[PDB]
Amino acid sequence: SHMQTKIQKYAGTAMPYPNRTDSMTPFYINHLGRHGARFPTSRKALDKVEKVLVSAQQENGLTSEGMALLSMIRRLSRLFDGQWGKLSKLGETEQEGIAGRMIRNYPQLFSNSAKIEAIATYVPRSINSMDAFLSCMIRHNPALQVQRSEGKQYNHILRFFDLNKSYVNYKEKGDWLPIYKAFVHKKISPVPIMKKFLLNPEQYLDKEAEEFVMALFSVAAILPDTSIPLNLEDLFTLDEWHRYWQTQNLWQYMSKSSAPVGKMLPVAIAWPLLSEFIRSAQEVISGKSDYQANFRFAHAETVIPFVSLMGIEKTDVQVCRPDSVSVYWKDYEISPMAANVQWLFYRDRDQRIWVKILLNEEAAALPISTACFPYYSWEKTRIFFNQRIEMAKKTLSVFN
Template sequence: MNATFRRVLSLCIAALSLLPICAQGFPPQLNGTMMPYNFSSTDSIVPWSDDMKPVFINYVARHGARYLSSEKKVESLRHTLHDADSTGTLSDKGRLFMRLLQSVDSVTDGNWGALNATGIYEEQRLGEEMTRIAPDLLAKGEATAVSSYVPRVVMTMYELCHQLARHSTHISVSTSEGRQFDSLLRYFTTDSAYVDYLENGDWKAGYDRFVDTNISASPARSLFTTDIPQGKLRKLTLDMYGVLQSLPAARLEWQPEIWFSLPEYRACWEAANLKHYYQRSVSEYSSVAAAASSALLDDIIRTNDAAAAGKTDGKVAALRFGHAETVIPLFALMRLPGCYYPEGSAESVASEWKDWEVSPLGANLMIVMLKDRVGDTFVSLRLNGRWLTMTSPDGNSYGKIIPWSALRKQWLQYIPTSH
C-alpha cells in the first residue's frame, strides 16, 4: 500500500464519520454559507494536457467548517424563551428549541467560532487535492501561506499546509498570520468606504422590505402560547434559522422540520443569501465591496506575473486564508461565473447568485499557472472544486485553459483607479 493510497484511504474513513445528520426533504444548500464543503461535486480530472506543466499555484480561501461564530444569537433566543417559560407561555416546541440551544452550548463548550472536526477534515482533504492536482510542482520548492489573525483561519492554514508537508519532505512550507494582513484579508474592517456602506448603505432598506414581505412569523410563533408582535416574530424566525443552519457543520442533529416548513426555511435562506449579496457582492446598490478587494486581486496578479517571468525564487505556491467576507467581494471583482450578478432584483437573486456556491465553508479559488512547451503561459481556475470556463469581455469563451496575458488584462481593468 503506497503512501498516497494510505492518505486517500484515511481521508475516506474520516469522511464516513463526518456524514451530515440531515433533515428529511430539506436540501443542505439551504444552510447557505454554513454549508460544509461539498466534495461530491468536485472535478477530479485536470483540464490541461501533458504538453503543459504547472509552474505555480495562487490560492485564496475561506476558513473551514466552524462552530456558531458567537453565543450572542443563542443567548438572545435563550433569554426570550426563558422569559416565556417563567410566565408559563412557552409551548412544547419552545421547550424543544430550548433543549436544542443547550445542545449547542454543550457541544461548543466555549469554542465559539472555532474550526471543528468537520473543518479539519475539509482542509486535510483540500490539501490532498492540491497535491494531486500538481504533484510534481509541490514535490519541492517553497509554499508560502498567510492568514488573518482569527484563530479558525490560522488553524485552517495550518491544517492545509500540514497536508502539503506530509506530501513531500522536500517542500518547504512557511506560514504567517496577524493583523499586518488586515488590509489584504480583512479589508471589510479597514476600507473606510466599505465599512460605511456596511453600516449605513441603502441596501438595508431593500433587505428589510424583503424580510417584511417574505419571512413568516409562524416558526417563531410556534414557540409560544401567547400573542407576540409580527415584527418581533420575524426577527426570532431569522434567529432560529441562524442557529439551525449551523448544526450540520457542528455535527449536531439537524431537524428544521420540527419548527419550519420547507418554504419557510427556504425563505430564510433567501433572506440570508440576499444580505450576503447586498453586503459583499456587486449589486444595484453598490460595487464598493468588490472595489475594497482590489489590493488582494493586485497581489494575485503580481504573484502570477512573477511566476510567468520565472522570478519566484523557488516559490511554488502562494496561499492566502481569510473569511467569507474576504472571498465573496474578490470573486465578484474577478467576475467569476456565478459570483457576479450586478443588476439583480431582490426577487431574482436567489436563482442567479447562491451563497452556498460562492462561499461554502472551506471555499477556495485555486489559480494554476501553466507553461506549454514553447514557454507561453496560461492559467486554469478551480473554484470550490470545479474548473471554470472563462469568457472574454466580448463574450468569447476561453474554455478552461486561459491565456494569462488576456485574463491579466481583464482583471486589471476591473480594479478601480482610486485603489
C-alpha cells in the first residue's frame, strides 16, 4: 500500500532499512554503514508524553483513547528501561541482509581466503552492527581472513562531527535553530491530535501542545525500530505524519547537511573520511594492500555529510527556502536505519578501473559524465572527489 509505505518514509532517519532483493564482478568494495535499527537514545520524549497524560489522568482529563495511550506509554517506559540506544533484533537482521546480499551478489569476491577488514566507533550499537554483519560473512565463508577493530582511535574519520569545534558550536547554537522552530510552529497543528487523547485540548498553551505532540511523534517514529510488537503509527493521519517528517527532515538538513544557513560547514567536516576512502582504494588498486573489502560502522551523522561531500545527486543541494527543502532533499533516502554507502570497483578487459556507487544498495549518480551509467571512470571520480576535499578544506579554513 502506497499510504503505509509513505507513512514509513515519514519516520525519516528512523525509517527501518527498506526492503531489498538479491541481484560483472568487482575486485574491491569500500563501505560505510550506519548501525542498524536501534532503540531511542533519549528518554526525554517518552517522559514528556507520560507526564502530560498522567496529569490529565489525575485531572480526569483523558478520553477513552487517551487512557489507552497512557497504558501503552507506561508499558513502553518499562520496555525501554535499560535498553536506550541499543541495537535491536531488527537492527541485527538488517545487517545480516546487507551482508547476505553482498555475498550472494559477488561470491567470487569473497571466495577462498579473501581478506576483509571492518572498523567501528566505540558506540555499542555500531560495534554490534559490525558483528552482526561480520558473523553473516563468516557463516557464508569461514575461510575469510578478518580484521576487526573499533574505538576512539577512529574518531577522526567516523566521528569528525565531535572533533570540529566550530561545527559543535553550530550544531548546538547555530542560526538554523530559529528557522527550525518557526517551521515547526507553521507545520504542526496540535489540537486535532490532542483532541484524540485529551478533554479540553484548547486549554493547553500552544507551546506545551506543540511539545507534547512533537514528543508523541518521536515515540511513534522510533517504535518500529525496537522489535517490540506494539504500534503507534495509526494515531496520526498521513498528512500529520507528512508534516512531522517535514520538520525533522529540515532539522537534519540544516544541522547535518548542505543547507545555506550552515555555509557547508556541516558537510566540509567529513573530508577525512572521503580522504581515507580514496586512500584505501588506491592501495588496493596498486597492490600495496590486498584487501577484498573495507567495512566501516558508524552513525547517521557520519553518513549524511559523507554522502553530501561525495556530491551524490540530490544530497548536496543548497536549498534557499526552508519550506522547499522537503521537495529536493529526503533524509529517508539518505540515512534510514542501517543506511550504507558502497563503492564497487571493477577492472574491465583493457584493465581500466570503473567504480559504481551504491546508496542503500541502489545506484547513485555523480555530477560527472559517464558513457555507461551506473559505472564511472575511477580516474574521473577520484579527481572529482579530490576537488571536493580541497573545497571542504577551504570551507573549514573560513571558519577557524
